[PDB]
Amino acid sequence: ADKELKFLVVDDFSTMRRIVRNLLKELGFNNVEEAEDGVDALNKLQAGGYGFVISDWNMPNMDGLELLKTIRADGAMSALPVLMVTAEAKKENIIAAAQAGASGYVVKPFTAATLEEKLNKIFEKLGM
């Protein structure tokens, strides 16, 4: 992907955001903004310019699944890559994220390799 690709990292705790932001930096992506929940995330996405969303599941105001679903139903964001990074690992939830159109799913705690791997596969699709 283009190194100027703009990312939105959504989590209600800074730890995940820092980890993800730093791994993104290691891969060469510095254009990264953060949000603290689904609503906060939607306010920034509506501002436009975003090219990739990575977000937690358990968050107040609007969780990750609901965020994913609104993004997928929005004519201006419907194809936005949405990679879930969350501690949530129960099967019924994994299946739900998949049925709602999640672009990928990484379980917390995750290694640097796992994130780069998942990210790169989504990136390949963005190129075709």
């Binding site: 690992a89 129960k90 998949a98 796992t114 998942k118």
Partner: peptide, 16 residues
Amino acid sequence: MGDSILSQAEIDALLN
């Protein structure tokens, strides 16, 4: 009864 938890590999099968 216990939960149905999926590993990262099982998750990769349908999401990654």
